Amino acid sequence: KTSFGSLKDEDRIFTNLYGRHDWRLKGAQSRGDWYKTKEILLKGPDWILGEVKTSGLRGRGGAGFPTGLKWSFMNKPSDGRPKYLVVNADEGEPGTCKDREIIRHDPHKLVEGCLVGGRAMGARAAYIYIRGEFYNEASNLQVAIREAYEAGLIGKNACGSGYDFDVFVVRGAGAYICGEETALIESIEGKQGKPRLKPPFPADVGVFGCPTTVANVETVAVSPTICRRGGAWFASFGRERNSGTKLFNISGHVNNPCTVEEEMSVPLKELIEKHAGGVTGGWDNLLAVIPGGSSTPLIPKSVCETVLMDFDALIQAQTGLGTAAVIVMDRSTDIVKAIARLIEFYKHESCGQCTPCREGVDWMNKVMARFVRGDARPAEIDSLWEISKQIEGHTICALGDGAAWPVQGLIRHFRPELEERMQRFAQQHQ
Amino acid sequence: ASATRLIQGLRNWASGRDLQAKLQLRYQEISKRTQPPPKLPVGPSHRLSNNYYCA
Ligand SMILES: NC(=O)C1=CN([C@@H]2O[C@H](COP(=O)(O)OP(=O)(O)OC[C@H]3O[C@@H](n4cnc5c(N)ncnc54)[C@H](O)[C@@H]3O)[C@@H](O)[C@H]2O)C=CC1
Ligand SMILES: Cc1cc2nc3c(=O)[nH]c(=O)nc-3n(C[C@H](O)[C@H](O)[C@H](O)COP(=O)(O)O)c2cc1C
Ligand code: SF4
């Protein structure tokens, strides 16, 4: 297969994403959830890890680490400490609202993923660090976890398999940096949600100093489907090292802002013109696309014509896949004001721990706040580039990376627009 | 420069040189004691980019 997309509804993992069916247990059992979960639990962790490593499932959090290889780091005998699956359900990323849809409309799929993945990693229980702003989604998830307990699917002797497994939900408290896995661990442990340094990677020292795997809602919820349908079924969609299906949030300047499941290596133009109703004013009215949520650098219309929506084709296009959240920006957009607002986000959402992010993201906000009006001279553009290169790679977590990258994308694709902004400021003010 | 041309001619004859052309006492030809404020230039490292000190 060389042309991807046009995914059939029989191949969607996330049936009942739109809330058009019962999200509860009688709805989920009439759609395919909780079917032969015991026969996945009783085939050991090794078969489940083989099915997930075969399926090519990479991290749906946004970095795309191989989820089976990540979960095989827990395949080790215990040292007296328990093991924990922790489901990252924060989703504070701008553009990204898909895990809200998964928790709100397929909760039992996430709970069965918690059970199966925790069997695969030998986990004691599952702490779902849900977002604090997703309150109704959290009570939604707790009602479905109550329905899974009362049916004996989780808890003492989960699904009749001799295996004990609890599912905990910890609400957030309004911090974007608590989506980062070590800061999420610190937020579960009742401290300031500040990211730890790595190593120890959380399979060595994680939550409470236990072995821990933090995994996204999407890469957990697809795991019973990977166990039932098979690894070859999931690897049969998308390119090699770019396997599976993926939820997409197309928002911004489109005619129909939507959440939709789609095949992995789908073209961006096909995705926007099919599921989103096109860009407002047509495809010819396109100026830029932030391809994968706010941290990934933007791409212009000359790149958006033939680009694909997976990891490798966006890394080749000097951006990233990220959360695969498409923020569409038409020709009427002040792009400098939008990216400066995005850097204003990344300094309002920054935990202040280490020097380059704490100082330089505020200093990039100040430089971008002068770039919006144009109250600067062009020797500060390249300067700003160097400042991004002094934050990219020198921080603890990748919010310094996620704050340096949109500045780099705006400079790299719209340096002449910044220069004409500043020179028209300098001519109508001096 | 206030000497009489008799004394000036005697002085030029005695030295053998023209002395009013090259006077050693200074007059209004010298620079003013009050000058306009300067604007001094900066060096090559007064840049905002490609200015790493290790380089
Ligand atoms: N989903 C969301 O809402 C958001 C997602 N992101 C994404 O987060 C990413 C940055 O997060 P990071 O975890 O710092 O990126 P990445 O460098 O660390 O690693 C991703 C995952 O692989 C694991 N890993 C990688 N190498 C490992 C090794 N040798 N041993 C053990 N585990 C290993 C990490 O523990 C982590 O869980 C970005 O790519 C960005 O797109 C950013 C903001 C919001
Ligand atoms: C600043 C920052 C914020 C993040 N926020 C989230 C988040 O809200 N939700 C999420 O699933 N991953 C988030 N991540 C990515 C996680 O670190 C981690 O990669 C992911 O949650 C689990 O990895 P996996 O996708 O391989 O399963 C964030 C990363 C960073 C650097
Ligand atoms: S770089 Fe920013 S987001 Fe990361 S540990 Fe430091 S303050 Fe926190």
Contact assessment for residue A162 and residue A334, using Cβ atoms and an 8 Å cutoff: no
B41, with CB counted inside 10 A (0-12, 13-18, 19+), is exposed
CA atoms within 13 A on the CB side of A16: 24
The pairs formed by A253-257 with CB atoms below 8 angstroms and a separation of 24 or more are A253/A279, A253/A280, A253/A328, A253/A329, A253/A330, A253/A332, A253/A333, A254/A278, A254/A279, A254/A280, A254/A328, A255/A279, A255/A280
Residue A116 in tokens: 């199966």
Q: Ligand 1: which of A207, A213, A295 to mutate, most ligand atoms within 8 Å of CB?
A: A295
Residue A170 in tokens: 């910890």
Say how many C-beta atoms besides its own lie within 10 A of residue A92's C-beta. Answer: 18
Rg from Cα positions in chain B: 25
**Element containing residue A116 per DSSP (H, E):** helix A107-120
Query: Of A396, A248, A405, A237, which is closest to residue A315 (Cα–Cα)?
Result: A405
Contact assessment for residue A179 and residue A92, using Cβ atoms and an 8 Å cutoff: yes
Alpha carbon distances (Å) from A120 to A63, A116, A168, A317: 21, 6, 18, 35
Query: Of A328, A295, A268, which is closest to residue A4 (Cα–Cα)?
Result: A268
User: Token pair 């994308």 is at which residue?
Assistant: A409
Cβ B48–A379 below 8 Å, yes or no? yes
Cβ A385–B49 below 8 Å, yes or no? yes
Give A60 Cα–ligand 1 centroid separation in angstroms.
10
Measured in degrees and rounded to the nearest 5, phi and psi for residue A70 equal: -65, -40
Residue A335 in tokens: 């792009």
Query: Of A274, A272, A268, which is closest to residue A252 (Cα–Cα)?
Result: A272
Instruction: Give the span between the Cα atoms of A302 and A286, in whole angstroms.
Output: 10
Q: State whether residue A315 is helix, strand or coil.
A: helix
Query: Of A97, A103, A145, A88, which is closest to residue A19 (Cα–Cα)?
Result: A103
Contact assessment for residue A109 and residue A12, using Cβ atoms and an 8 Å cutoff: no
Query: What is the amino acid identity at position A131?
Result: R
Instruction: Give the span between the Cα atoms of A194 and A177, in whole angstroms.
Output: 7
Would you give the DSSP letter of residue A37?
A: S
Give A61 Cα–ligand 2 centroid separation in angstroms.
5
Residue A366 in tokens: 């100040």
Q: State whether residue A236 is helix, strand or coil.
A: coil
Roughly how many angstroms between the first and final C-alpha of chain A, as a whole number?
59
Q: State whether residue A322 is helix, strand or coil.
A: coil
Contact assessment for residue A226 and residue A98, using Cβ atoms and an 8 Å cutoff: no
The sign of the dihedral angle between the CA atoms of A178, A248, A262, A135 is: positive
Our CA-based measurement puts residue B49 at a distance from the nearest CA of chain A, in whole angstroms, of 5
Query: Of A20, A31, A25, A19, which is closest to residue A105 (Cα–Cα)?
Result: A19
Is A379 within 8 Å of chain B by CB?
yes
Strands A325-330, A286-290: parallel, antiparallel or unpaired by DSSP?
Answer: antiparallel
Find out whether the peptide bond into A200 is cis, omega within 30 degrees of 0.
yes
Our CA-based measurement puts residue B39 at a distance from the nearest CA of chain A, in whole angstroms, of 20
Rg from Cα positions in chain A: 22
Contact assessment for residue A267 and residue A306, using Cβ atoms and an 8 Å cutoff: yes
Instruction: Give the span between the Cα atoms of A329 and A214, in whole angstroms.
Output: 33
User: Token pair 């495809």 is at which residue?
Assistant: A283
Contact assessment for residue A308 and residue A341, using Cβ atoms and an 8 Å cutoff: no
Query: What is the amino acid identity at position A128?
Result: I
Query: Of A195, A301, A212, A292, which is closest to residue A250 (Cα–Cα)?
Result: A292
Contact assessment for residue A126 and residue A86, using Cβ atoms and an 8 Å cutoff: yes
CA atoms within 13 A on the CB side of A119: 30
Alpha carbon distances (Å) from A167 to A110, A115, A128, A150: 10, 8, 7, 13
Sequence-distant (6+) residues with CB within 8 A of A351 are A175, A177, A183, A192, A193, A194, A195
Best probe of the B interface among A377, A382, A390, by most B CBs < 10 A, is A382
Give A288 Cα–ligand 3 centroid separation in angstroms.
28
Distance of alpha carbon A365 from its chain centroid, rounded? 24
Alpha carbon distances (Å) from A414 to A293, A316, A405: 19, 19, 14
**Shortest CA distance from A378: residue in chain B:** B48
Alpha carbon distances (Å) from A157 to A115, A126, A310, A334: 11, 15, 39, 57
Instruction: Give the span between the Cα atoms of A345 and A23, in whole angstroms.
Output: 33
User: Token pair 């898909």 is at which residue?
Assistant: A98
Contact assessment for residue A279 and residue A255, using Cβ atoms and an 8 Å cutoff: yes
Query: Of A110, A118, A112, which is closest to residue A137 (Cα–Cα)?
Result: A110
Domain A25-236 has CATH 2.40.30.10: no
Roughly how many angstroms between the first and final C-alpha of chain B, as a whole number?
60
Residue A201 in tokens: 């990677």
Find out whether the peptide bond into A202 is cis, omega within 30 degrees of 0.
no
Strands A125-130, A84-89: parallel, antiparallel or unpaired by DSSP?
Answer: parallel
Say how many C-beta atoms besides its own lie within 10 A of residue A374's C-beta. Answer: 20
DSSP letters, B7-19, are HHHHHHHHHSS--
Beta-strand ranges (E) seen in A191-285 are 212-216, 245-252, 258-263
A357 in contact with ligand 3, CB cutoff 6 A: yes
Residue A77 in tokens: 């005998």
Instruction: Give the span between the Cα atoms of A129 and A190, in whole angstroms.
Output: 12
Sequence-distant (6+) residues with CB within 8 A of A86 are A126, A127, A128, A129, A181, A184, A185, A188, A202, A206, A207, A212, A213, A214, A215
